[PDB]
Design a protein around this ligand. Sequence first.
Ligand SMILES: Cc1ccc(CCCO)c(NCc2ccc3nc(NCCCN4CCOCC4)n(Cc4nc(C)ccc4O)c3c2)c1
Ligand SMILES: Cc1ccc(CCCO)c(NCc2ccc3nc(NCCCN4CCOCC4)n(Cc4nc(C)ccc4O)c3c2)c1
Ligand SMILES: Cc1ccc(CCCO)c(NCc2ccc3nc(NCCCN4CCOCC4)n(Cc4nc(C)ccc4O)c3c2)c1
Lengths: 35, 35, 35, 49, 49, 49
Amino acid sequence: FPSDEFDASISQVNEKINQSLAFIRKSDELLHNVN
Amino acid sequence: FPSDEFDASISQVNEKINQSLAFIRKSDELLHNVN
Amino acid sequence: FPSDEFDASISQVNEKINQSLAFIRKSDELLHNVN
Amino acid sequence: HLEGEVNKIKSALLSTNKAVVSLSNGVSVLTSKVLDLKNYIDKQLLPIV
Amino acid sequence: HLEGEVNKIKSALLSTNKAVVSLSNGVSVLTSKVLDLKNYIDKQLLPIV
Amino acid sequence: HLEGEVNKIKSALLSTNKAVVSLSNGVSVLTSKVLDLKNYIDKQLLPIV
Ligand SMILES: Cc1ccc(CCCO)c(NCc2ccc3nc(NCCCN4CCOCC4)n(Cc4nc(C)ccc4O)c3c2)c1
Ligand SMILES: Cc1ccc(CCCO)c(NCc2ccc3nc(NCCCN4CCOCC4)n(Cc4nc(C)ccc4O)c3c2)c1
Ligand SMILES: Cc1ccc(CCCO)c(NCc2ccc3nc(NCCCN4CCOCC4)n(Cc4nc(C)ccc4O)c3c2)c1
């Protein structure tokens, strides 16, 4: 893996999930700094 | 259903969707209390 | 496409993704109006 | 003015929440279709193969 | 009162963020299952077909 | 101080919104791949089976 373009697209989905989680981390960090 | 581990994983996706919707419900309820 | 109910469901997923992006657009537009 | 701002943010978050509901509903439909594909393979394809 | 409101919004957004994490985790599992289906077709179905 | 807080929340929600866009784009790619799998089964597998 990845053996072909289908597997490469699956990898891209995983990269977008990781980007999502990263943006949530940043949002959470900003909020834990709010009082 | 579930007949195997593939079906059990599908059930897990459905549980995560329901968790998502639950967290949105809570957020909505907090906001409808804002003025 | 769509050739059948499976393809019609796929189209529905795409419509829900577009609805999601539309609601984010609206949220972004409201925030870019915040100071 | 500031309560106006706070209100824009409440409205914005209500819209973001609708985005997440919409996406969740799309993922639910997609999940159903993946399960349908798996069952089609096991119960339509494999028995004639 | 207003800081109370601001606080409700912070709490709300923390909950929205948990929603997005939950949905992301569900999409990650679903993605794995789609890859499994593709590999099953190529490595279990096609060789006996 | 409080406008500072309000500003942190605006920034946070802008980041949450980027999360939802990213996840939506991943679900769009995944959806395309599920449709590709369905078409492969019907148009590559079934005709040789
Ligand atoms: C025993 C059992 C278990 C599970 C299922 C899948 C869910 C119910 O359809 C079935 N389906 C039977 C079943 C029987 C006839 C079907 N006909 C269709 N679609 C119409 C034909 C589409 N054309 C488009 C052009 O290329 C050739 C195929 N589908 C839709 C379809 N649906 C899926 C999921 C995959 C491929 C697919 O073409 C059928 C499903 C049967
Ligand atoms: C070489 C290779 C590569 C990839 C895979 C898929 C991931 C690992 O299972 C496999 N799986 C072998 C493999 C071998 C025996 C298996 N048995 C099952 N499930 C139990 C049977 C389920 N029943 C339910 C009723 O209708 C008939 C099928 N699965 C689960 C399953 N899993 C998928 C993804 C699709 C269909 C499917 O039934 C198997 C997978 C093998
Ligand atoms: C008529 C018709 C309609 C739809 C499709 C699918 C989308 C376009 O590829 C096709 N594809 C033809 C087509 C022809 C040759 C192909 N070769 C590959 N991949 C390279 C081989 C991968 N190896 C990895 C190891 O185990 C054996 C398979 N794919 C990628 C691939 N893609 C999918 C979706 C499923 C399985 C799969 O291996 C092909 C798709 C054809």
